[PDB]
Symmetry: C6
Subunit: 131 residues, 6 copies
């Protein structure tokens, strides 16, 4: 998670495992009722401002292997080029929604913008995988 520190600088801390497991245990599986976890994750993406690694823990903990895969491919399918249209260009897809750890630095506007987009695409992925 990230939060704005008292000094005007973002501050990082890892998710407590109790939160992750509580979220899991108080909801149906994604397959049973996708709306439940999707709404929970949409909320957390905002309040907890997760990094890319944090998102991997969210997904890894709340979804099964098969569910996560569906979501990730759905998220990559939601990437748009600069012309606002879908794109399947590897470099564009990889840049927006990387499958391997990116070098995004949350102390930079560049890093922050990628994080914003990543979270937006993650949500889209879940919404579409649910449907």
């Amino acid at each position: 998670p990230l939060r704005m520190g008292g000094n005007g600088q973002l501050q990082y801390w890892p998710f407590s495992s109790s939160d992750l497991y509580n979220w899991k245990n108080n909801n149906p599986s994604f397959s049973e009722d996708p709306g439940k976890l999707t709404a929970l994750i949409e909320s957390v993406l905002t309040t907890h401002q997760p990094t890319w690694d944090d998102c991997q823990q969210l997904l890894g903990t709340l979804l099964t292997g098969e569910e996560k895969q569906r979501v990730l491919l759905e998220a990559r399918k939601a990437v748009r080029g600069n012309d606002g249209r879908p794109t399947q260009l590897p470099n564009e897809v990889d840049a927006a929604f990387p499958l391997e750890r990116p070098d995004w630095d949350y102390t930079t506007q560049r890093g922050r913008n990628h994080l914003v987009l990543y979270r937006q695409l993650l949500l889209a992925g879940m919404q579409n995988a649910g449907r």
Copy 2:
């Protein structure tokens, strides 16, 4: 939640899931007995000074979709104009009780003021929805 920090400045931390689920598990549903969750949320709105996002999280966890919709509707119906009378002017309803994430900056007096009003309206909404 927001709390005043060491430098007389508001600091933010997300709700602990243990608190949210403890609140859920120790009270009847809103439909079952609205007074209990209403009183709890009234209290939490003050002690935890939640942001707009926190409020969506609080509500989404403690109320069903059906219940929350009812609550948000009553809240918007309780908005008053500068003449102390009910107002249905969309711009005024939306400015006081937005249904989508507003740009309220809690470090500013204006955002702080919007948050106090949002919380009062939410409470009025729960009270009215309860009746």
Copy 3:
């Protein structure tokens, strides 16, 4: 709760729900054995230095509605005037033990003094209600 922070600043944090429910679960009800919760709350009023809102949360959680109302009624009957003698003057009663949220600021000496007095009266009210 309030505590003296590291910059000679009084610092606020909300009660943990785990503490509130643990206190309820490990004691008989106020009606069953008033002495137990009275002693617990007496202690907490000092160790946790609760604000007026904290006190409402505390009482609202540990006492039933009828119990709480009895306690507040008795607290208000235990107000004294500036001569140190009992008073029933509504203005002195409302100033020392408001039933609605006061404008008390814990960063001011006046607010702090009001809080010390409010907690003292709350204890008196619990003792008298118990008896």
Copy 4:
């Protein structure tokens, strides 16, 4: 509890109820096996550097009313006059081991000295009450 802060300034924080109840739940009653809670409290008196209020809370949670009264009685019997010999003079007994909240300020050397003595006497009291 008290701990030395960064600048050698003691900082106060109240006991977590989870610690108090875990200690209770993982030991026999004082009456069943005095040495158990005695050793636990002895240790806490050092690691947590409790204030007078903390001590009341610790004893009030872990001992029954009757057990606690016996401990406080034995503690008071262990008070010594300035000559290092037993004293039963009420002014001396009350200054060293007050039954009512004293005005000790842990930010002063004298308040600190009073607390050290109080804890020492409390341990003696438990030891002797145990016998």
Copy 5:
């Protein structure tokens, strides 16, 4: 765990036992399904930035002695020289993946670089042992 604070200060805190045991309790053994604990540990290596001591504690808690010994053996088999080439010269293996506590200092680039390398080799070791 290590986290970055203020304006760049690394800060150490030991793992919470609740986290370690939750991780253990919500996953199959390494021998039953290596990919699960592997993915979890890989994630933790990044989010919690564990020291060498932390890594021993993490492995010791989540893997049996046999499993842990296999992982460390494989990590050591995957050591490379500074030039990127594989090496099994004893001194270079020991420098990159020590079996005994090293004197790495996280306030120096040399220390931080050693820890980053250790975690990388640990991951490789788990993957290989898993295979």
Copy 6:
């Protein structure tokens, strides 16, 4: 526990009871399988840098009275003198592995060194008692 602050000053905090009881509850007794608790304590001695008092809580919580006494006996039997050779001279044994609370100031070289030695001897005691 002790940890290093950014300014190089050690900072003390007491063990959470949740950690101590979790350690106890997730492991066999020392008499059952000495290796388990021994390894656990070995790890805690490093990550948590416990003081003498902390070590008493670890031992007193994780071991039975008989086991603890046996561990302390073995630790004291393992003491070495100024020559690095074994010694059983009372003053040297009591200085290295005191049974009563010592005056070790962790801000001094001498105090830190006594602590490191105490922890090493505690581990030796456990290993030897296990055998």
